Symmetry: C5
């Protein structure tokens, strides 16, 4: 039971993050851009899988996709780059613990969110240039998924955003609670398996879904307005999951009061 | 063999548990709520898998479910949160070893059970909010499974509860006997694989099964009375498995006379 | 590091007899746990056997093998007393003069009986679940028990030999590594090999027969059949664990 | 984050590579040759798989290929041999951090490329000598893939080269950021799964694809020209991903300014 | 790097190996017998899989077989027993580094080879005793495979031996380069997956294939003549892959070329 020690670590991570931004916006945005790109790589992989298996009428499609998404957050954690969603639990916890302020928190959130988007846009442009979404089941999978994500009612997206960032943030929490990098990766694998296959919504992964779909000439299904709609609802849910549940929760567990 | 060392660890853990509760009810309940919700996350995943594969008439359904449940107790162990079924072995061993009283034991059992339920209820509510059990295979898998669990004879449920918590508690026992976080997860993975696929009954997991089934307007195959009937029977079996077998068993192995 | 490994087996054999001498209750409880833990693996893979056989899957025996790891993993990770592993440990320690032949047949008899008690307890409770009342799982239990009891002695014996080479070698590996993950992986590999290849394990068979005989579901087994298989497989296990692994590890580690 | 220490490790690794070359061309070229062959060994495996599953009409072909390619970079990393692609991030980061010169960088790039090719040629010759590509589904998978890679448009190969080496190099980046050899291998497995299954292009791996196809008398439709066309386009893409993204990126993250 | 330390370890191993053989021929042959039998255990498993999936017309057959062969070298490495094929790299490297002599080498190679063969025969004899190859797809898989290996052209068998032992030895090489036992097993799992599925030939493993078939009663369609053929070709291949490639390779990488006390790099 190292709840106190854990809260200390979260607090210290929150302090490191705002310090980094204060020290250098370039370093912070480059870090954020890597993470958004790393997450997008997971999307490129499982949407390829989605296309191959959906085309095949496989009933295992969504299961194989969940099993195969682990690389997204594994890369972020193993490279120590800045990810908006995890920042929800970290900043909220550290703020509550008086290590950082409400101002530092909204700042980290806004920069990391925008920086992650930069990575998704860059990934989308390059992926399109591969010609891999020119035509076929993979392009179709992007188009249909982007459309479904954009036409889904707000309430549903929001709540899917909550459960998603509970899983993402708890996998980040595990990485703070162990010294085994392998166990970190395993826990990340399990959590991303759970959230992808269950149907939960991640704001940063979705950036790449819309990035690819919008930059691609072969895909005329969704528009920027749709992307913004989905992203706003999912981002708000992510925040509630990561800050209101995980952040507030771990503070309460760890706060020597 | 380290049987004494293990008993000392169990005894320490029991003491630390009752101290947390005595120190702060809010912390204890928040911790319990977390565990309940983490276990529930496993149910959402494997029930999604259930619906998917059952609809397709796959023979692998229950095997894939068992293989995919690991996250449930993996999250509990890696976050160090209070789980009722695990507390059955810990408090019991510690009690026999005079580390904690009978009253402490009943108190810890009652609070964790309720806290676990709070987490299940919350998860259930939010999950229904996702729209993910609005219609289709997953909703039907929840409704049908909840029903078959609620109509099964008491004796059958009881004994399934015994075998389940032997497995859950032995997976917890293993984590007290290794310093390797990966080995803990692996053993947890194996144990949950065994108890899910074999057909054994877990009270805290069942909490989420019924919270979803009752909170969802598209699920009316069961009633509160049914959920209560199952929970009582299964809880009773869980307790026997955890305290009578694992608790007393580990006490006997490690008690220097 | 053969020498140090022999030392480890010798100390383990010494610890076993000392435990039995100090407390029969503790030794039999430990034994009962191991038998139950192994039985748990049988409950899992026979559930799988039922499900996949019913479906005419060619992968049935391959999935059973991959899924049996929990059986010896639980034993190893809980530090409980398993008969089959004891065949190598005691024989090695015996040849090394850490324990006597008398100690060895005493440990072998007590762990065997204690393993059985675990199997019986498990069978009874598992039948109580109603999980083998009817269906392909109950049928897989009945059919497997029946085929194992009717098989010729010589076949069971040699299948018992190869099974315990694999089981005891996985135990040997656990003495040669400080990594718990490595132990479990080798156990996984070895049980995969012995289940899927079709070798026979006495202790696991105990649960096969306690379940089949405790279940009112009609089979062609009988107690005479169970005892037959158990005797044939146990002797086989003993040769493979004692004559091969026990003797071999002693020869490798003995400074002579 | 340990960005400074990471950049420091990259720089020392770059310094060590040029040192080795300057000390002994034979040593460096033997190391390079090993890496090229180790990578080629991955190709023999997944192209055997590709053949078997292609001939079966399995929709899982590319998924199984991706999952089975881990050995390629795992061997390189575990043997500490010189691989051209990974050298793109390492020499560029080290060069930006003023540990090695631009000349050292293009020297290491030229020598490791040629060394890698020699391994691929040695492997290709020996493989053909086994008679495994005399005829059949594996021979045809080598023949057809070599052709489709040689006839693909430059821009598509280029961008696929970029994304491939971001994945290879980030997997190399991870090996620099953990002391766990198991975690190194898991991350390599993930990154190679992602790049293979997604369809990205790797220059060194293609060397073996073309050595096998060209050395094989089992008639096909490639030619040295087509091989040169593909290798040039993919190599340039690899360089951009490894140097311009990963090298520059990690340099900015860890630079003391 | 760290090739120099690795070369030291290979040299020390070759030394320990010849010391043991000189200390006790009984201890060395028992070790070699274990290793041969551990490898064969892998064959019994994956050949059972062969039969089961071949008879079902599965396309995943050779993939599942490759994935399932890891136990063979995993047991050898984890038990620290003497396996002929690994000895090709070890002895050759140590020899080049002047830790052991050409005579020392050929003696280890000869004794380990024979020791491994003993384990296979003993394993084959016991396996047939199970009746598991009395009749059916598994018995047939052994028969058919033993035939094809015995009736394959020499050059092909030779080159398949080379690539096999490159893969077997590089996995042994990885075990010298890591302190993580789990990573050792994983790398072994990968290399044996690759070598089995790709279709390369391992001499020691083939000792059990022919052992089972020549001790098996249900027909032959083979002949010891075939076994000797295969075993001879594959063995020379193994030695080349292990000694010429991996042995010489690691030496070159790790020999600090100050010394030079004899030869010059460039
Ligand atoms: C490529 C350039 C990216 C620029 C992103 C800047 C996002 C600014 O975001 C704003 O930052 C303020 C502090 O400056 C905070 O007070 C606000 O809460 C926040 O919205
Ligand atoms: C975070 C959401 C991703 C925003 C990426 C916007 C990139 C838009 O990209 C543009 O989209 C237009 C239509 O939408 C197309 O007509 C253009 O061809 C395309 O370049
Ligand atoms: C949401 C608030 C949850 C409070 C749960 C408290 C229920 C306590 O319940 C009782 O606790 C006693 C000790 O206090 C035990 O002795 C009794 O066995 C138990 O029934
Ligand atoms: C895909 C599942 C494979 C899991 C492989 C587990 C590899 C973990 O590796 C193990 O990690 C431990 C940390 O707990 C360390 O103590 C051990 O030294 C190390 O071998
Ligand atoms: C421990 C078992 C969980 C009990 C939670 C009961 C919450 C019930 O909740 C109610 O369920 C009714 C039907 O069941 C619905 O008609 C109502 O809309 C809903 O509010
Ligand atoms: C639940 C009761 C089970 C008790 C099992 C006791 C079996 C004793 O077994 C016997 O023990 C003797 C020494 O006591 C040895 O000399 C014999 O070799 C051994 O067969
Ligand atoms: C047998 C294989 C020998 C290969 C030696 C390659 C020598 C490469 O040499 C390098 O080439 C670079 C461009 O190619 C130049 O930029 C460098 O100045 C030059 O040193």
């Amino acid at each position: 039971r190292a709840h106190k020690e854990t809260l200390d670590k979260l607090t210290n991570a929150a302090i490191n993050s705002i310090n980094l931004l204060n020290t250098s916006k370039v370093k912070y945005l480059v870090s954020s851009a890597f993470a958004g790109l790393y997450v997008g790589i997971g999307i490129l992989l499982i949407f390829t899988i989605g296309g191959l298996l959906t085309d095949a009428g496989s009933p295992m499609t969504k299961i194989v996709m969940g099993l195969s998404f682990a690389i997204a957050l594994s890369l972020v954690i193993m490279t120590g780059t800045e990810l908006f969603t995890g920042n929800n639990m970290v900043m909220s916890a550290g703020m509550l613990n008086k290590g950082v302020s409400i101002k530092d928190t909204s700042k980290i959130w806004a920069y990391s969110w925008v920086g992650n988007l930069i990575g998704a846009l860059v990934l989308g442009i390059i992926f399109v240039g591969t010609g891999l979404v020119d035509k076929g089941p993979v392009a179709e999978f992007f188009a249909n998924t982007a459309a479904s994500k954009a036409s889904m009612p707000f309430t549903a997206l929001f709540f899917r955003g909550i459960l998603c960032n509970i899983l993402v943030c708890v996998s980040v929490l595990c990485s703070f609670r162990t010294n085994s990098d392998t166990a970190k990766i395993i826990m990340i694998f399990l959590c991303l398996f759970a959230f992808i296959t269950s149907g939960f919504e991640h704001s940063v992964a979705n950036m790449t879904i819309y990035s690819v779909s919008l930059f691609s000439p072969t895909i005329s299904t969704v528009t920027i307005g749709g992307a913004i709609y989905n992203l706003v609802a999912v981002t708000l849910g992510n925040i509630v999951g990561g800050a209101l549940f995980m952040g507030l929760g771990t503070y309460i567990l760890g706060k020597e009061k």
